Design an enzyme around this catalytic site. Structure first.
Site, PDB file in Angstrom:
ATOM      1  N   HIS B  20       0.885  -1.158   0.000  1.00 29.26           N
ATOM      2  CA  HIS B  20       0.000   0.000   0.000  1.00 29.26           C
ATOM      3  C   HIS B  20       0.925   1.211   0.000  1.00 29.26           C
ATOM      4  O   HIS B  20       1.505   1.560   1.036  1.00 29.26           O
ATOM      5  CB  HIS B  20      -0.927  -0.016   1.206  1.00 29.26           C
ATOM      6  CG  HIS B  20      -1.850   1.157   1.277  1.00 29.26           C
ATOM      7  ND1 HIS B  20      -3.217   1.033   1.170  1.00 29.26           N
ATOM      8  CD2 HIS B  20      -1.604   2.476   1.455  1.00 29.26           C
ATOM      9  CE1 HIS B  20      -3.773   2.226   1.273  1.00 29.26           C
ATOM     10  NE2 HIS B  20      -2.817   3.119   1.446  1.00 29.26           N
ATOM     11  N   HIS B  46      -5.193  -1.125  -3.600  1.00 26.22           N
ATOM     12  CA  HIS B  46      -5.662   0.170  -4.088  1.00 26.22           C
ATOM     13  C   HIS B  46      -4.849   0.624  -5.295  1.00 26.22           C
ATOM     14  O   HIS B  46      -4.270   1.710  -5.316  1.00 26.22           O
ATOM     15  CB  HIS B  46      -5.610   1.238  -2.993  1.00 26.22           C
ATOM     16  CG  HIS B  46      -6.129   0.784  -1.668  1.00 26.22           C
ATOM     17  ND1 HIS B  46      -5.322   0.215  -0.709  1.00 26.22           N
ATOM     18  CD2 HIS B  46      -7.371   0.836  -1.133  1.00 26.22           C
ATOM     19  CE1 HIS B  46      -6.045  -0.076   0.356  1.00 26.22           C
ATOM     20  NE2 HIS B  46      -7.293   0.290   0.125  1.00 26.22           N
ATOM     21  N   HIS B  94      -6.776   6.062   8.556  1.00 25.95           N
ATOM     22  CA  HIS B  94      -5.411   6.531   8.754  1.00 25.95           C
ATOM     23  C   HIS B  94      -5.193   7.153  10.123  1.00 25.95           C
ATOM     24  O   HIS B  94      -4.082   7.615  10.400  1.00 25.95           O
ATOM     25  CB  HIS B  94      -5.038   7.534   7.663  1.00 25.95           C
ATOM     26  CG  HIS B  94      -4.860   6.914   6.315  1.00 25.95           C
ATOM     27  ND1 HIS B  94      -5.097   5.579   6.075  1.00 25.95           N
ATOM     28  CD2 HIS B  94      -4.468   7.446   5.133  1.00 25.95           C
ATOM     29  CE1 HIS B  94      -4.859   5.313   4.803  1.00 25.95           C
ATOM     30  NE2 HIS B  94      -4.474   6.429   4.210  1.00 25.95           N
TER      31      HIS B  94
END
Lengths: 222, 114, 238, 114, 260, 79
Positions: B20, B46, B94
């Protein structure tokens, strides 16, 4: 005739002290010689004179041809509220008032009922708008009126520059003669401009005009 | 450096590496990440970017042979409400406090409906 | 009617919200649990109705409870209510922030802070460096990233910044927009000053001898502003 | 060095020495007696925070490297009400104090190595 | 040709809360807009950040912002980061922001500088309405482009209209048009080699022209000036090589206004 | 032009280039995963455009004829 009266009123109004920031440029040492003065004059005519004076003149001419007093007053209000520099605003108001007073007093002739009503109803008439409505009432051609106004203003600008830089009369004549093509280009641009571009915000010109107040010694009114 | 070392150890031990990528472009862009990968098998989370700084250029890695690209649930399929929840999900995932000016300013997304 | 555990949980939440709504109708001031349940259940029902979007629901969730409908402290305790609701276009997360205005009377767990500023990185002198982002994307640098090894699209005197990090609150970041030039303050990295990781430009103790190797590596790898002598003398290990 | 407002500092890291917090909705106020952290070196986890490879997570950790670290916790105990990081290793409390990376931070003991 | 599923709108209405702080009474935002809870610094005004969840305005973006500050609200409205106008191929990016300030309300609208990219076409239309007692500190910074990579005046067109009315009467008009195709913006009258331009308007603020001029003079690296408009409100125009001096000058002026 | 390619001939056959002789050959892309390992150790990784630059720089350094790499070559973290 018409040209003689235009010249007479122009001489009685404008020559009878305004720098529009040229004094600030000279004091800050941005205009020093013939080429620098020519570049400054071209830039000023392209931005501020074009989008504040010639465009306003054309708009007022059209509005007076359509007999739109409300439109004329709205244009004047927009100009007044967009003219951020205090020196520029005061100079424009003083020149417009002088032009109106000269037309009312010295010109002992039938200027026009529309012009008389506009003078009696106006509050803050700019010089360019006053000249535009005067030409519209007198039937003067739009292109001719714009050319004459631009030529007179540039003559005043070049004589001010030759007095203040200082330059020589030869350089003044040279810069007057070398601006003929930009004059035609500016007139052509105004021939296709519109009200959306009215009072387009110049940046460095307005900054210098506002710094003119903070200048040490001011040899020019604005 | 971490990408390179992890890929070395994974080639030694025959295990997959998933990534990621860096949202902030702190150490480099997608080109620098791909140079660190150096044509070794990598499974990307992603791959559309999910609003990261590598987006939308990180989608370019989905054409490479060595990259196995995966896409997450929330952005598929693209619907009317897809874009509304993204910032809240990003901040909570996050761990950026929504009551802190610094964290809110930090929470910058490059997500686009395109 | 095959029911999933998620559906069972949502049913429990809906009936908790129904209980909260009945208490509110009775005129009981809602507590924290009742307020959260009421907001969540209302959002779920609106989403099931399907006449509103997630944005409309986020707006509407903030109008359900007046400050006089809840007990003191509930509005302070509730910061945001998240709920995953099934819309006609799938499941979406609706987040309602500050759904109730704080009365200010009672604040559970409130902080009573001193009026004195915290001095961070005390005893460390900061140098100023001008950084330009010549890349096409913004770049965020953390408080503890070794500034010498930042994105090579940032342009600055890397020699000045070897061994240094940003002098900001730890955990915060500085953003450089593309084309934008900023001035940042840098302080020496503390502790053992062993730089490992990052862009692998140092990977060793940060001293003047490793500075030359790092500068040569950065120049070779194309890091902007890294100036190394053309006649560079290699070492045995580098 | 730099000074940040105490409100912003507390929002980022929790209360520090001399700060008071109300316990629940009661009338009891607990004051932080002392703080083990070094200002400007606080451990934070997140997107671009400090708990990252090479910054606060050591790349050459001590042999007593923690299994779990609780960062910026307000410890309320009969031994005192203070602020610290709690390190847990092998099911015991390995250390209480300033944790992090000895390579890039000062005052990090061997038993609090992240 | 809006790429978003729905129209990009941001209707915000703030009022004074029960505890005396400035709270968000109502808000409705579609992507890319987003609103969080207001931030309350220890000593300053209540800060609201207009979040834009996007790398920047692209072709077909049409944003409709409507801010409504209620009476007795001391609000500073900022943005997340620099507003970047991307390459709009054949279309344009448009923003229409209508602000209404109530009685005895102070609004400090201080967005981040606008950075237009190459071939960027932007149309901004801001209409601010005030009461007699309302105070406004409007600001706008425009960059010539990505200066550090030699992207100077490569955008298509930047049109920005600002209309400030007091008691439903026009008091300020601004029409900033930047078209590099029609004229060279690098000339001695437009930018004169500067890359960042700050335009700031102080309406009903209790700060003197002498104080503003002293702030401008003591600010370094900036060629700036301050004058009084027709409606007796202050207008500041500044030019700089970078956005740092302009932001520092703007925050200095804001501090001078707020310390009163 | 020939990075990532092999001769387009029957598998198991060979093309002979005599000294001084100039021949024209047909090349086709290498199939499969396109992972080049061994040979002269010029690639030793996946064959793509990014590894093409590294391979060209390596070939120019090792003196392979016709390998043209830019004088101002930017190294990567692993190469």
């Amino acid at each position: 005739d018409n040209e003689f009266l235009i010249l007479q009123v122009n001489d009685a109004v404008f020559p009878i002290t305004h720098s529009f920031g040229l004094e600030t440029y000279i004091q800050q040492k941005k205009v020093t010689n013939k080429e620098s003065a020519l570049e400054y004059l071209k830039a000023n005519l392209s931005s501020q004179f074009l989008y504040t004076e010639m465009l306003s003149l054309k708009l007022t001419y059209e509005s007076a041809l359509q007999q739109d007093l409300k439109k004329i007053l709205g244009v004047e209000e927009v100009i007044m509220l967009s003219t951020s520099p205090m020196e520029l605003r005061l100079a424009n108001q003083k020149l417009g008032n002088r032009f109106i007073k000269t037309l009312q007093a010295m010109n002992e002739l039938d200027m026009g009922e529309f012009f008389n009503a506009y003078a009696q109803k106006t509050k803050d008439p700019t010089h360019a708008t006053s000249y535009g409505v005067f030409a519209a009432s007198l039937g003067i051609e739009l292109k001719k009126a714009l050319a004459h106004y631009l030529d007179a203003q540039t003559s005043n600008m070049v004589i001010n520059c030759v007095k203040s830089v200082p330059l020589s009369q030869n350089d003044g004549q040279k810069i007057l003669l070398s601006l003929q093509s930009p004059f035609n280009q500016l007139i052509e641009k105004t021939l296709e401009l519109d009200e959306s571009h009215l009072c387009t915000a110049s940046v460095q010109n307005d900054i210098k005009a506002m710094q003119h107040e903070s200048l040490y010694s001011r040899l020019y009114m604005s | 450096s971490a990408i390179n070392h992890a890929l070395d150890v994974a080639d030694k031990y025959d295990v997959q590496v998933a990534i990621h990528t860096d949202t902030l472009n702190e150490a480099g862009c997608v080109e620098d990440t791909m140079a660190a990968i150096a044509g070794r098998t990598m499974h990307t989370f992603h791959t559309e970017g999910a609003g990261g700084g590598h987006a939308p250029d990180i989608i370019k890695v989905a054409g490479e042979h060595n990259i196995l690209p995966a896409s997450t649930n929330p952005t598929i399929p693209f619907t009317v409400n897809t874009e509304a929840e993204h910032m809240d999900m990003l901040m909570v995932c996050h761990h950026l406090d929504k009551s802190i000016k610094e964290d809110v300013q930090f929470a910058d997304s490059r997500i686009r409906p395109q | 009617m095959k029911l999933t555990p998620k559906e069972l949980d949502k049913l429990m939440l809906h009936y908790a919200g129904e209980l909260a709504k009945k208490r509110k109708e009775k005129g009981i001031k809602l507590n924290y649990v009742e307020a959260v349940a009421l907001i969540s259940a209302h959002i779920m029902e609106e989403a099931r109705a399907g006449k509103k979007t997630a944005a409309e629901l986020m707006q509407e969730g903030r109008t359900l409870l007046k400050p006089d409908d809840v007990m003191d402290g509930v509005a302070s305790m509730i910061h945001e209510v998240g709920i995953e609701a099934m819309f006609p276009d799938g499941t979406k997360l609706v987040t309602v922030h500050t759904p109730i205005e704080a009365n200010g009377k009672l604040v559970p767990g409130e902080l009573f802070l001193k009026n004195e500023d915290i001095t961070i990185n005390e005893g460390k002198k900061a140098v100023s460096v001008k950084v330009k982002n010549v890349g096409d994307r913004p770049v965020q640098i953390g408080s503890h990233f070794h500034f010498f090894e930042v994105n090579r699209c940032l342009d600055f005197d890397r020699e000045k910044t070897f061994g240094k990090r940003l002098d900001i609150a730890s955990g915060t970041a500085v953003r450089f927009e593309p084309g934008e030039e900023k001035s940042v303050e840098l302080i020496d990295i503390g502790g053992n000053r062993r730089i490992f990781g990052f862009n692998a430009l140092v990977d060793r103790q940060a001293d003047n001898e490793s500075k030359k190797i790092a500068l040569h590596r950065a120049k070779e790898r194309g890091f902007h502003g890294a100036k190394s002598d053309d006649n560079y003398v290699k070492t045995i290990k580098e | 060095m730099k000074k940040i407002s105490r409100k912003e500092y507390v929002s980022m890291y929790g209360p520090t020495t001399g700060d008071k917090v109300r316990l629940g909705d009661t009338d009891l106020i607990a004051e932080v007696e002392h703080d083990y952290t070094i200002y400007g070196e606080e451990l934070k986890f997140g997107g671009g925070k400090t708990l990252r490879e090479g910054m606060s997570q050591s790349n050459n950790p001590s042999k007593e490297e923690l299994d779990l670290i609780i960062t910026n916790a307000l410890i309320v105990d009969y031994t005192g009400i203070y602020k610290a990081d709690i390190g847990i290793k092998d099911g015991k409390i390995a250390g209480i104090g300033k944790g992090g990376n000895k390579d890039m931070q000062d005052g990090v003991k061997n038993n609090l190595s992240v | 040709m809006n790429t978003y599923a729905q129209e990009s709108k941001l209707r915000l209405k703030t009022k004074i809360g029960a505890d005396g702080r400035c709270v968000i009474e109502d808000n409705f935002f579609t992507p890319p807009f987003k609103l969080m809870a207001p931030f309350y610094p220890k000593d300053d005004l209540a800060e609201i950040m207009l979040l834009a969840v996007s790398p920047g305005m692209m072709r077909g973006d049409a944003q409709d912002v409507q801010l409504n500050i209620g009476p007795n609200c001391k609000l500073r409205i900022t943005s997340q980061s620099f507003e970047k106008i991307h390459n709009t191929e054949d279309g344009f990016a448009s923003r229409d922001m209508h602000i209404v300030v109530g009685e005895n309300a102070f609004l400090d609208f201080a967005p981040f500088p606008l950075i237009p990219f190459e071939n960027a076409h932007f149309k901004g239309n801001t209409t601010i309405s005030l009461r007699s007692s309302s105070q406004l500190l409007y600001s706008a910074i425009i960059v010539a482009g990505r200066v550090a990579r030699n992207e100077l005046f490569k955008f298509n067109r930047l049109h920005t209209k600002i209309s400030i009315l007091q008691d439903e009467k026009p008091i300020y008009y601004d029409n900033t048009i930047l078209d590099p195709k029609t004229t060279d913006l690098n000339n001695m009258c437009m930018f004169d080699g500067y890359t960042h331009y700050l335009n700031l308007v102080l309406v009903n603020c209790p700060i003197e022209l002498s104080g503003v001029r002293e702030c401008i003079e003591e600010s370094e690296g900036v060629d700036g000036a301050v004058s009084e408009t027709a409606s007796s409100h202050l207008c500041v125009k500044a030019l700089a090589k970078g956005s740092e001096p302009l932001l520092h000058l703007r925050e200095k002026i804001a501090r001078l206004v707020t310390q009163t």
